[PDB]
Amino acid sequence: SSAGFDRHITIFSPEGRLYQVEYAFKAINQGGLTSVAVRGKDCAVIVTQKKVPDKLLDSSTVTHLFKITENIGCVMTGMTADSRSQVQRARYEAANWKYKYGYEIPVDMLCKRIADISQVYTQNAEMRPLGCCMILIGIDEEQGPQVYKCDPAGYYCGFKATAAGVKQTESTSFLEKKVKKKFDWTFEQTVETAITCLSTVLSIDFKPSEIEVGVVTVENPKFRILTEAEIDAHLVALAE
Amino acid sequence: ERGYSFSLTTFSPSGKLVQIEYALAAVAGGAPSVGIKAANGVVLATEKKQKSILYDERSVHKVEPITKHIGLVYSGMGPDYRVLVHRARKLAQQYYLVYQEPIPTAQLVQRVASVMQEYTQSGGVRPFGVSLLICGWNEGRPYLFQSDPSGAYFAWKATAMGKNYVNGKTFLEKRYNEDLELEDAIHTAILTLKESFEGQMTEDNIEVGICNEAGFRRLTPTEVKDYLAAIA
Amino acid sequence: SRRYDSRTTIFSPEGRLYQVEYAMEAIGHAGTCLGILANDGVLLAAERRNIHKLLDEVFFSEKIYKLNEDMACSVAGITSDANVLTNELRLIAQRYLLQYQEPIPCEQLVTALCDIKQAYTQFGGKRPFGVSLLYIGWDKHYGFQLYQSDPSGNYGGWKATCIGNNSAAAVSMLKQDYKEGEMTLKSALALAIKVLNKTMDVSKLSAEKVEIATLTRENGKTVIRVLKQKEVEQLIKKHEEEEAKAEREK
Amino acid sequence: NQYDNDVTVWSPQGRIHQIEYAMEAVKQGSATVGLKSKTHAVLVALKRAQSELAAHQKKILHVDNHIGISIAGLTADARLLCNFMRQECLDSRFVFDRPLPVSRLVSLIGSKTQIPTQRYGRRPYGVGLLIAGYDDMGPHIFQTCPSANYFDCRAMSIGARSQSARTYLERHMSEFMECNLNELVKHGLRALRETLPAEQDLTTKNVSIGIVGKDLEFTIYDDDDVSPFLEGLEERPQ
Amino acid sequence: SYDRAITVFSPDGHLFQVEYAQEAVKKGSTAVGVRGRDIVVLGVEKKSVAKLQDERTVRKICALDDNVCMAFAGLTADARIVINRARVECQSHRLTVEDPVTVEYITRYIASLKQRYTQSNGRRPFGISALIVGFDFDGTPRLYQTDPSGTYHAWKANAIGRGAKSVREFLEKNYTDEAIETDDLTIKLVIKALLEVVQSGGKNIELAVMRRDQSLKILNPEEIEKYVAEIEKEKEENE
Amino acid sequence: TGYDLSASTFSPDGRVFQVEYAMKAVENSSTAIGIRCKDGVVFGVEKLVLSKLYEEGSNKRLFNVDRHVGMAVAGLLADARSLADIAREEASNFRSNFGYNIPLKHLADRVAMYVHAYTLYSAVRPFGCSFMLGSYSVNDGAQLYMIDPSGVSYGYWGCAIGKARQAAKTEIEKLQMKEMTCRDIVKEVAKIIYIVHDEVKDKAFELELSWVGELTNGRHEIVPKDIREEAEKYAKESLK
Amino acid sequence: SIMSYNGGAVMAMKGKNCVAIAADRRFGIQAQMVTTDFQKIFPMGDRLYIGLAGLATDVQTVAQRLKFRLNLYELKEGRQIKPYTLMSMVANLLYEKRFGPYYTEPVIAGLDPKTFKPFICSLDLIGCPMVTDDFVVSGTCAEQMYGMCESLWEPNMDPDHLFETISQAMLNAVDRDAVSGMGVIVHIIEKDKITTRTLKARMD
Amino acid sequence: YDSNSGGEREIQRTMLELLNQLDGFDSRGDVKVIMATNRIETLDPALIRPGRIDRKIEFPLPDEKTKKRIFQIHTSRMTLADDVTLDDLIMAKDDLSGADIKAICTEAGLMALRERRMKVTNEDFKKSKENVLYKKQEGTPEGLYL
Amino acid sequence: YDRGVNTFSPEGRLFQVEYAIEAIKLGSTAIGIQTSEGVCLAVEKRITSPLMEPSSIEKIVEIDAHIGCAMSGLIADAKTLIDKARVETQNHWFTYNETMTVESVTQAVSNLALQFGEEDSRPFGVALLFGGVDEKGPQLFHMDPSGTFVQCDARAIGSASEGAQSSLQEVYHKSMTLKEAIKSSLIILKQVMEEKLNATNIELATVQPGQNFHMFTKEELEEVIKDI
């Protein structure tokens, strides 16, 4: 049911429900992308994938992994059109923290700053909701690794392990019993949890090429994407 | 009619105003936060429950004190809370350094809620469904105030919104009368707070803020459960 | 469906004011106030919307706002929309006292905010002010002046006022009790007690749920008297003593 | 038909009719056929007036020395761009001290009409301008449309009953690149007179003719100036 | 088909909200008036005052200068703006061009401002009108009117409100040179034409006579009764 | 029910049909494809002809934005020249401030924000025209990036735009790009472009060709027909 | 200079339970007298004053802008203003003009609104508050200014001794100069009552 | 309509049968047609072509001269009472019909029989003057100050 | 249906522009004539009530010393553009030292004819008739709110312009002098008017290079009456 302009605007329904925002919740679901964010003891591993319909697809540009800072990366979901616009913004707001405040941002406030203007995108319907979804990571002093996620409803969010998106609902359900455990996680254990959670969602387990797996650990604090050489090495390690 | 259009606010044929009235219906569907004005201090007990066990409450904080002597809690929806937080963080600190002194919280509720009035009352495109429970300590006598999206500031010794707003307000209307003992007022305020609350109560299921006359102190789930349930 | 469209800018269609008819409906919603003629002073009354005793009552004067040392006002309407008008006229009265170093005459004062409220009811599609606030004070020319603000821009200022729509029962009482030259401000105060105990829906004149604010002319202090509930309680027993005296006749 | 209101909102089929609605205003104007040879160019238009005593309003006018133009449709946007054409022609004539070729000049006109056809609250502009000019490589004839698409042509025609002009143009426009001015002008009116109904004039004051060349400055030919062009004419058959 | 009216004209060539606005002048406060070679008079009444309320607050007709006075009708909300808006311009015509305010200048300002007042979507139109009352320099009379479309027109006498043409028919006999030869008969003729307008009870009746360039004074219930006595005596001796 | 009118506002299904209207408006345009070889990037445009309709060789969809960059565009010609000037002004900012060759990856991101911002505001409209971005440099190399009206930034070895983008990209997978010279890559497009898009629908037409690469020393200029023996390479195998 | 143009000297010396502030009555252009009734110290609220020395315009303009923002705060909350609040109000108002600041010598002397505790402070024309507990020193001749006030001003002063202390202080420093003179007014306020006196000085 | 029927659409088409019935085919003579109803716009312009194009009149609010005249003729044939004056009846009312001035004197005679008086008695004169002081004869919005 | 005003029609064309032509019908009827010796024009005042002053509203105004004018349709919108061009003719007499030509007066108003801006929110439906004597002698110009400019030897506007233009072109004389234009003006006048002719019913406007200005003078209207 709808009355007035509430179809085209974000005002709340007589039941206290938003319209243009509730349609953007599944706008990420139409993107067809599953990014699960899980954090171990000293490390956090992000697992993603991509589709290659045509043989002309370039791995470089179509790669969904985006690195905001040397020590802070991210990943997106849903429509990739709006996601790139938020990527360069996170680079700009992190640089303001570098310029003004002089040091690296904890990224906990970066989620707040991005979601604050993401709330402005949710404020006026003339500037479009910008239905791109953002998932963040980073390193804070004596906090170990961190994991953060922001959808385009405009709040800052992060926890131990949090995943939301198209198929991420089936991933978090299996990981509740899987992640606990809840003890010190080796690098091979975190990668094993990336395929096993994907095996419950998908169970295709195709070539490690198409899937993109990042990691954030404290040895060198800089964020690094896993090389295709080591991904196939850990893939044959968990499956004997 | 209609007839009032917008800017700053919408229209009603009979009373109040339609449109944002529907956002007011979402205010009752927000997170319930109890509050207590007891003796020389103000106590604020909120309710926070995560969707799944994969979440840790140590990250997201529902209590974000603007000043050392003034805390706050929110009754309502999401980041529109955090929007007025940074606002009041800018708003209250400007007036703090204008005269260089905090000045009693009565003028703080005057100025800080003045722009919050305009911000909530004036057209924001989409409405704002976040209300607040205002607290502080002024000249030895603290204050507990309750704002709303409509911009009507109240004064309560014990108040509740969100859930129990129908039950808890009538509860505190009967059992609580005038001013009573400090910790004894917290007792009956939590008894009605657990009325509609879930049967499972843990350190992470709620949070209790307290405004001392010596300045605000934000508690943690550790000391929240170690106090009492039943905190008194 | 010519008048069913949301406009708020241009007028209606037979010459009647479009929104002003609906603006007076909001004035008659939960409004309370009264006024009467008094020599060497003036008196006003207020009513607390919430009778719940758990309130702190730390707002002190709430339905009565003091915009000047020699002048005050009584808000009837939405409190959120009126708080913008409070500081507005207060700053306009302050910038006038700043400019001429002389107290702002209430002639142009009231008409200033009435034209300020008129601009919001004229153009820009802006929401009209649904709050009607009174005016009281003293000037060097006409002395005691009483005014009432209206949304349309034409003030309802008179020597008497009706707030709200429920006060229409007191209007026939004020016209029948209309008198000139006798004060004794308590003669009208005891009459205002009869207004609340009879014409108003709430009987017995609950003290904590009402307020009485009076202004007595004093040179040059012009003391504004916030009572508030102190001797109103004995005025309750005073009006009931009149009711106990009236039943002795029959 | 509600999807044709807003120019910003795309239709269900993607075709915005606000341009096609202005195409009607371009096609509701007078019949004008422009053409060019290698040596010189000859552009022709038509005049119509309210009454008999009212002088027929002229269309072809002069802007740049080497740029002649015609016009059809709304005169409001015509003289707005005409004065805008003056400012654009005097840009390089002042700073660069040289005239602007039609090639790069109309690229600014096409961008000037892009904003009113894009943003909300704006309307397209019906324009019947037929632009001519001579750069180092010879003459160029463009076209003006609300779609803001200009095409370099030897001959093109817009306005009313101009579909019959293109048919007479196709075989003639290839053969008109050779002959000189005089016989080309009377062959130009031999086109429009077949488009227009054959039972009426076609007087001296109801027709517009102009000629521009590399070494010949553009001169407006109207009224008595048309008389040398209308003498020695072959009457239309029956 | 029919979009009613916002700004752009209706298919018939006219407007609606304008025509709709003139009916407010019909339901507004009625007014009358006359002019003469030297002295001029006017009237409004339609006060609906019960005397139990402040009489100075309901006062409407004012004067920019002693030479030119303002007489309006309808609601006083927008008219209070017409007062202040004309007071600033008449003070500018005071300031610039120090000569006494000419009626052509001041009326065009209000008219040019009353046209942009009805223009934007934007500034709200006027639903009321007004009629300028005063005298030209050297004792010559001047009276004009205003229109919601921002135009001005001059009349021989002021007749508006209910029965504009009916009073104008009575103003045909007012065209005689006898009115106004003496200010005693003119005021008696004002109460005559006003007797057919509304109640004409004598209470709310308010008339101010301006003789030559001297500022007008509202007639108190003293001379008004004497001018009503000679009007009743002229009616009794007419048989 | 009126949900597809506003481009800025979403629809109950989670997307906007105005983007589908702009995407299918590109489908109505004539076939223009592109492919990148080892040392260069090949561009092409098929220009339709009805009657004449005008002087041959003008108002072509081939545009030159930058020294090392080129344009193959389709759709409405005014918005094609508009998007050409938007990129021309963008290439003018990078050349003004810096003065060296703008990388094609970051150039596509700058144009991405432009086209994306046009889809955000309901005041302006999403452009229903598409273009082909490609470039070559000695340090950079040959890249070909495809941009869509929705604002998605990405690139493939080859792309297809026109009435049918399926049958046009069908033979590109069997076409040998690297090993065969760029001059042979031009004829590989010219042969099938005559094969497909049959002359029954459009009687007369003309095929525009443009190439930039090492043989041109990084400069972009339209290559004529008879040059580089392309006229004979066009009709050789295209008669089948 | 702008200061010495209109002249004037403000000296606020605090007693034991009371606070006194005084300023000369002389108002004139340079060496020429105009009128002695021009008011310098103006009342602010109740039981609190402020001194001003400098251009009469900057004396009236600031006092008008100060009373402006003061009544704005006092009408929102009926309670009075604290000396620390007024000290920050004048310092912020004078700092709003960076390169254009008004030339004056504001001296705030008044009781606390809550209790009888007196407090005084002095502010620079650029908005710099100068914190002094009780006594301030000014004048013309150097030996009388700092030499006498040490043995004159007591740690605890009564209104009697405090009035005679600033008396000879304004007699020796002012009347020594030829153009200085024309009387001095003294304002001594306490919680019980407000006392206002004037100093006897020659008219030459 | 009462209540839900055949129906919200077709009932307009069987009312359209009335619309064509009055068009009409073929209207010639009379059978006079005099219509009384709120709005005339229900008839289509095609109906006006056969008729009836003569004129339509509106009944204005009767003024004090009409109130007294209507009340006089009704009391002309049937004799009235002398103690009841017609001046205070027409003066105390503004814009009222001739029927409304009638029964305000009936509501006085209404309560009069409760006192058991068939005769004309001065006890009702005050109770009728009380109905003049009772006012309430007219009301209509307004409410505004113009 | 669903007329989009300045936004075009589904057919299509402008609509309110045509409705602005209807706004000429409601105005007073003015019939202009251009002759070799001068330009004569007449329009009915159409006095509604005897309270109306005859010279209060006039349809003939003077733009420049040598330029006459005749307004149409609305008044306030006319006098707006009237006084406007009067300032435009003043600035043209400064920089160029010469009075503004009647020609350039058209295109000056024609640029602002339809702005679709704050003026021209709603456009003005005022037609303008431009008379005067330029360097080419007496001329008479006609324009409409849409900005059309066509030089007419004799032009009529207002209500009766339909029936006025009928008998106009028939009895019009291009090569004759003002002597016949005198009686030729009252012909169409007495036709369209249904009431007796007096100085207050209509007004005459005659501008000549040698005799001017003139404009017109008092009590020359009743002279034409008795000359019948």
Short mmCIF file of N, CA, C and O in Angstrom, two decimals, chain C residues 158, chain E residues 29-32 42-55 58-61 190 194 197-208 218-221 224, chain H residues 145:
data_model
loop_
_atom_site.label_atom_id
_atom_site.label_comp_id
_atom_site.label_asym_id
_atom_site.label_seq_id
_atom_site.Cartn_x
_atom_site.Cartn_y
_atom_site.Cartn_z
N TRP C 158 -7.26 42.98 21.02
CA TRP C 158 -8.36 43.77 21.56
C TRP C 158 -8.09 43.99 23.04
O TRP C 158 -7.01 43.67 23.54
N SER E 29 -14.56 44.83 3.90
CA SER E 29 -15.17 46.01 4.49
C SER E 29 -15.55 47.01 3.40
O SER E 29 -14.70 47.41 2.59
N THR E 30 -16.81 47.41 3.38
CA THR E 30 -17.28 48.38 2.41
C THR E 30 -16.76 49.77 2.75
O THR E 30 -16.38 50.06 3.89
N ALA E 31 -16.75 50.64 1.74
CA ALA E 31 -16.30 52.02 1.92
C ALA E 31 -16.96 52.90 0.87
O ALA E 31 -17.37 52.43 -0.19
N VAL E 32 -17.05 54.19 1.19
CA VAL E 32 -17.60 55.19 0.29
C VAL E 32 -16.71 56.43 0.33
O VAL E 32 -15.73 56.49 1.07
N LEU E 42 -14.99 61.04 2.96
CA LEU E 42 -14.93 59.60 2.75
C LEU E 42 -15.74 58.92 3.84
O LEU E 42 -16.29 59.56 4.73
N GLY E 43 -15.80 57.59 3.76
CA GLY E 43 -16.44 56.80 4.79
C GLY E 43 -16.16 55.33 4.57
O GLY E 43 -15.91 54.89 3.44
N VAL E 44 -16.22 54.58 5.66
CA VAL E 44 -15.95 53.14 5.60
C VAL E 44 -17.05 52.37 6.33
O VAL E 44 -17.78 51.58 5.70
N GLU E 45 -17.18 52.58 7.63
CA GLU E 45 -18.07 51.81 8.51
C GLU E 45 -17.68 50.33 8.38
O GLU E 45 -16.48 50.03 8.31
N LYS E 46 -18.65 49.41 8.35
CA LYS E 46 -18.38 47.98 8.25
C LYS E 46 -17.37 47.52 9.31
O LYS E 46 -16.58 46.60 9.07
N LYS E 47 -17.40 48.16 10.48
CA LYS E 47 -16.43 47.84 11.52
C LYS E 47 -16.82 46.59 12.29
O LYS E 47 -15.94 45.84 12.74
N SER E 48 -18.12 46.35 12.45
CA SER E 48 -18.64 45.22 13.24
C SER E 48 -18.08 45.23 14.66
O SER E 48 -17.84 44.17 15.25
N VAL E 49 -17.89 46.42 15.22
CA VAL E 49 -17.31 46.57 16.55
C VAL E 49 -18.45 46.63 17.56
O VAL E 49 -19.41 47.39 17.39
N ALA E 50 -18.33 45.83 18.62
CA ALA E 50 -19.32 45.80 19.69
C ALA E 50 -19.00 46.76 20.82
O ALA E 50 -19.71 46.75 21.84
N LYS E 51 -17.94 47.56 20.69
CA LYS E 51 -17.45 48.52 21.67
C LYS E 51 -16.87 47.86 22.91
O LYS E 51 -16.34 48.56 23.78
N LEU E 52 -16.94 46.53 23.03
CA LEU E 52 -16.32 45.81 24.12
C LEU E 52 -14.86 45.48 23.85
O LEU E 52 -14.21 44.83 24.68
N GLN E 53 -14.32 45.91 22.71
CA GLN E 53 -12.95 45.64 22.31
C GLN E 53 -12.26 46.96 21.98
O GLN E 53 -12.91 48.00 21.82
N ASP E 54 -10.94 46.91 21.89
CA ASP E 54 -10.16 48.13 21.67
C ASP E 54 -10.49 48.74 20.32
O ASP E 54 -10.43 48.08 19.28
N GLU E 55 -10.85 50.03 20.34
CA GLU E 55 -11.28 50.71 19.12
C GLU E 55 -10.10 51.15 18.25
O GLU E 55 -10.24 51.22 17.02
N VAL E 58 -8.77 48.28 15.75
CA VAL E 58 -9.54 48.07 14.53
C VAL E 58 -9.38 49.21 13.54
O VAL E 58 -9.86 49.10 12.40
N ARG E 59 -8.72 50.30 13.94
CA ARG E 59 -8.53 51.43 13.04
C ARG E 59 -7.70 51.01 11.83
O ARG E 59 -6.64 50.39 11.97
N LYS E 60 -8.19 51.35 10.64
CA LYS E 60 -7.58 50.93 9.39
C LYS E 60 -7.11 52.11 8.54
O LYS E 60 -5.91 52.22 8.27
N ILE E 61 -8.03 52.97 8.10
CA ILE E 61 -7.66 54.09 7.23
C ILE E 61 -6.64 54.97 7.92
O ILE E 61 -6.84 55.43 9.05
N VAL E 190 -23.14 62.45 2.12
CA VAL E 190 -22.38 61.23 2.39
C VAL E 190 -23.21 60.27 3.23
O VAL E 190 -23.29 59.07 2.93
N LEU E 194 -24.70 56.63 1.98
CA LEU E 194 -24.30 55.56 2.89
C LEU E 194 -25.49 54.91 3.58
O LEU E 194 -25.37 53.80 4.10
N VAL E 197 -26.25 51.60 2.23
CA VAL E 197 -25.13 50.67 2.30
C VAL E 197 -25.11 50.03 3.68
O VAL E 197 -24.98 50.73 4.69
N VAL E 198 -25.24 48.70 3.71
CA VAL E 198 -25.21 47.91 4.94
C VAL E 198 -26.27 48.41 5.92
O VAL E 198 -27.39 48.74 5.53
N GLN E 199 -25.91 48.45 7.21
CA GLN E 199 -26.87 48.84 8.24
C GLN E 199 -27.02 50.35 8.34
O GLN E 199 -28.15 50.86 8.46
N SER E 200 -25.91 51.09 8.27
CA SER E 200 -25.91 52.55 8.41
C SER E 200 -26.60 52.97 9.71
O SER E 200 -27.50 53.81 9.72
N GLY E 201 -26.15 52.38 10.82
CA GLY E 201 -26.73 52.63 12.12
C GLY E 201 -26.18 53.82 12.87
O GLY E 201 -26.73 54.18 13.92
N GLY E 202 -25.11 54.44 12.38
CA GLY E 202 -24.52 55.59 13.03
C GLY E 202 -23.43 55.26 14.03
O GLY E 202 -22.63 56.14 14.36
N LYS E 203 -23.38 54.02 14.53
CA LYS E 203 -22.35 53.64 15.49
C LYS E 203 -21.01 53.42 14.80
O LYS E 203 -20.04 54.15 15.04
N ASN E 204 -20.94 52.41 13.93
CA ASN E 204 -19.70 52.10 13.22
C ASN E 204 -19.37 53.11 12.14
O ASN E 204 -18.29 53.02 11.54
N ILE E 205 -20.26 54.06 11.86
CA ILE E 205 -20.01 55.05 10.82
C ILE E 205 -18.80 55.90 11.19
O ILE E 205 -18.74 56.47 12.29
N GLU E 206 -17.84 55.98 10.28
CA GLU E 206 -16.63 56.77 10.47
C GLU E 206 -16.36 57.57 9.20
O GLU E 206 -16.20 56.98 8.13
N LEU E 207 -16.32 58.89 9.33
CA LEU E 207 -16.10 59.78 8.19
C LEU E 207 -15.06 60.82 8.56
O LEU E 207 -15.11 61.39 9.65
N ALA E 208 -14.12 61.06 7.65
CA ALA E 208 -13.08 62.06 7.83
C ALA E 208 -13.08 63.01 6.64
O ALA E 208 -12.94 62.58 5.49
N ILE E 218 -11.28 62.83 11.92
CA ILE E 218 -12.42 61.93 12.03
C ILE E 218 -13.53 62.62 12.81
O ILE E 218 -13.31 63.17 13.90
N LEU E 219 -14.74 62.60 12.26
CA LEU E 219 -15.87 63.27 12.89
C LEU E 219 -16.29 62.54 14.15
O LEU E 219 -16.58 61.34 14.12
N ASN E 220 -16.32 63.26 15.26
CA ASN E 220 -16.77 62.72 16.54
C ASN E 220 -18.29 62.64 16.56
O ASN E 220 -18.97 63.28 15.75
N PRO E 221 -18.87 61.87 17.49
CA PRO E 221 -20.34 61.82 17.58
C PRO E 221 -20.93 63.09 18.17
O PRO E 221 -21.71 63.04 19.12
N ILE E 224 -21.38 65.00 13.84
CA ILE E 224 -22.06 64.00 13.01
C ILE E 224 -23.55 63.98 13.31
O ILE E 224 -24.37 63.79 12.40
N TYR H 145 -11.71 37.60 10.11
CA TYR H 145 -11.84 39.05 10.09
C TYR H 145 -11.28 39.60 8.78
O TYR H 145 -10.08 39.51 8.51
#
